[PDB]
Amino acid sequence: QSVTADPSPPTNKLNKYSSRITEPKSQGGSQAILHGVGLSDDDLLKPQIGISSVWYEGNTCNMHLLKLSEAVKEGVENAGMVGFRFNTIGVSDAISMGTRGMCFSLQSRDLIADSIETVMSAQWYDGNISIPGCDKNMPGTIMAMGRLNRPGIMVYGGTIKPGHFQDKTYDIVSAFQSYGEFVSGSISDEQRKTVLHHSCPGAGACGGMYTANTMASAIEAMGMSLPYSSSIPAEDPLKLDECRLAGKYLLELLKMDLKPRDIITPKSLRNAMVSVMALGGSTNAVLHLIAIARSVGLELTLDDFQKVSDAVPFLADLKPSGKYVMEDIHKIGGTPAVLRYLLELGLMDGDCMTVTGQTLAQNLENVPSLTEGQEIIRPLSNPIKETGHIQILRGDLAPDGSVAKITGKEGLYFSGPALVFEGEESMLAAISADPMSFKGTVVVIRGEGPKGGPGMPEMLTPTSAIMGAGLGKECALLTDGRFSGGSHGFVVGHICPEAQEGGPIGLIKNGDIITIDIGAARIDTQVSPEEMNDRRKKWTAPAYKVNRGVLYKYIKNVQSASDGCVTDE
Ligand code: FES
Numbered sequence: 001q002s003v004t005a006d007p008s009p010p011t012n013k014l015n016k017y018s019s020r021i022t023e024p025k026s027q028g029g030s031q032a033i034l035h036g037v038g039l040s041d042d043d044l045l046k047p048q049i050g051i052s053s054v055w056y057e058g059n060t061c062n063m064h065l066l067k068l069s070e071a072v073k074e075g076v077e078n079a080g081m082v083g084f085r086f087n088t089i090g091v092s093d094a095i096s097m098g099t100r101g102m103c104f105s106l107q108s109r110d111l112i113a114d115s116i117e118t119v120m121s122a123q124w125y126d127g128n129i130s131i132p133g134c135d136k137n138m139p140g141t142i143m144a145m146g147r148l149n150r151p152g153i154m155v156y157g158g159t160i161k162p163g164h165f166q167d168k169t170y171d172i173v174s175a176f177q178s179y180g181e182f183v184s185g186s187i188s189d190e191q192r193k194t195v196l197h198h199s200c201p202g203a204g205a206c207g208g209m210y211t212a213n214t215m216a217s218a219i220e221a222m223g224m225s226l227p228y229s230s231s232i233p234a235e236d237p238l239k240l241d242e243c244r245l246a247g248k249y250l251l252e253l254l255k256m257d258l259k260p261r262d263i264i265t266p267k268s269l270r271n272a273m274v275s276v277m278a279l280g281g282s283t284n285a286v287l288h289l290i291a292i293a294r295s296v297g298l299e300l301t302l303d304d305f306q307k308v309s310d311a312v313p314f315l316a317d318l319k320p321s322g323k324y325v326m327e328d329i330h331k332i333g334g335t336p337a338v339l340r341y342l343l344e345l346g347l348m349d350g351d352c353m354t355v356t357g358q359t360l361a362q363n364l365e366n367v368p369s370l371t372e373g374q375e376i377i378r379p380l381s382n383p384i385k386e387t388g389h390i391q392i393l394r395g396d397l398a399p400d401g402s403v404a405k406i407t408g409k410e411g412l413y414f415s416g417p418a419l420v421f422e423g424e425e426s427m428l429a430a431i432s433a434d435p436m437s438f439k440g441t442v443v444v445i446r447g448e449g450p451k452g453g454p455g456m457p458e459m460l461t462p463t464s465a466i467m468g469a470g471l472g473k474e475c476a477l478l479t480d481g482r483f484s485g486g487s488h489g490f491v492v493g494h495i496c497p498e499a500q501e502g503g504p505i506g507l508i509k510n511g512d513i514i515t516i517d518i519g520a521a522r523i524d525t526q527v528s529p530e531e532m533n534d535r536r537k538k539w540t541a542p543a544y545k546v547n548r549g550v551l552y553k554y555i556k557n558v559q560s561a562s563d564g565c566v567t568d569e
């Protein structure tokens, strides 16, 4: 598609956009403001870099990003350019998890994209350096870069370090699990409170291979971050050094005029996907990479993810699936060492251009390989799973697609009577009151999609409640929303069409025999197509849960999960 969104420049000029306001006499107003903010006449000749951080104080993932932003600005000035900082909003999935505040999470990606697009366009900045630090922030910044197509680099804020106390390790997942362990009797209240005080020891994104590190790693593999960006910890002095170098790299991108639509291509999108499959990355990457692909006028379907999943084995022994965390990847050569191995295996396209001004292959020629003896990244001949974790399922109940994380440890089939709930809350009340009624069932939590939720909330409490009741492998879990963790069993999200839109998931009744088949890739119902059609004629959409504000705008704008929940088409 031909993307028309933002202003064109008015060709070896480095100030292609800012010249619109710095050069003409008829933009004297603009120049007056710029003198006011501290620019000399000589400064007006230089390129202007929009430096977009997602700093805020109330989240560990984001509290350090103002300091990083200052270091990016200093490096832009050291590279002979003007650096102009601005800052957008973000939200904390870790804070808002288990609450209605989670309805505002996914849409913050799209709000972030709109924010950066807005400032870059209005202020006529020539290039962008973005400093996201948390889940949704990362793709939001890349989407903005794709829309604008101005030279850009994403500096990942970096991963949090695991907490340590009295020779035990903790992360955010320890803190989530602590409640269930207390209720079951596995730990005391004092041990519970100890976990909370030592789970998050400083700044940076959640530590394992959840969405932040998945997306950071993916975006490095896509060529839109500098080498090591995804693997250097937040509090590591090298992160600050990377910040101070971004300016030098971006200067070179302006000389080359190497733009996001030159770097983000079908092949580099594939490279990103390869990294998700190899590292055991989150199912959320499906939504985010589709959104990134659309931002540059390219197509990316659920089927494309299945093909890359089938082609690429799961190799990384990393949480949540495995043992180690993102800090351990840093110790054995970082993300470049991982990607170097995948390139040597023939799994990636080396000729894709990157933000270094060189190709992926060129970047990876000159990096140390995975440390001899390391046990984190398995060899090709002994993978953790022969294909990727990410599985696309269709069938009667998800005719437009759905996404699941499949380890290989759960078997190929599950069949059981449907147990249907109209939101998360009613599911949690039922399993609390009568846990044994869930045994052998296919649990359906519906009305939690993009429009129905609203906001397509991510839900953790259902899987942990199932685990806490001892029913992990003894029931399946289906939703039009999203789930956070694995149940050691069949857990499917992103079911399309969502129940709010009258998809078959909205027509399921209690007792319907639902059969999940992984080999066939189908979520089927024993109810006849005719009886499902009769139910469809009786069905009417429930009223929207909001009538005003940002979530009502989301309801009006958002596309399906199968289309990456894009809001601007
Ligand atoms: S709440 Fe920020 S990456 Fe988890």
Ligand SMILES: [Mg+2]
Binding pocket: 093, 135, 211, 458
């Ligand atoms: Mg999340």
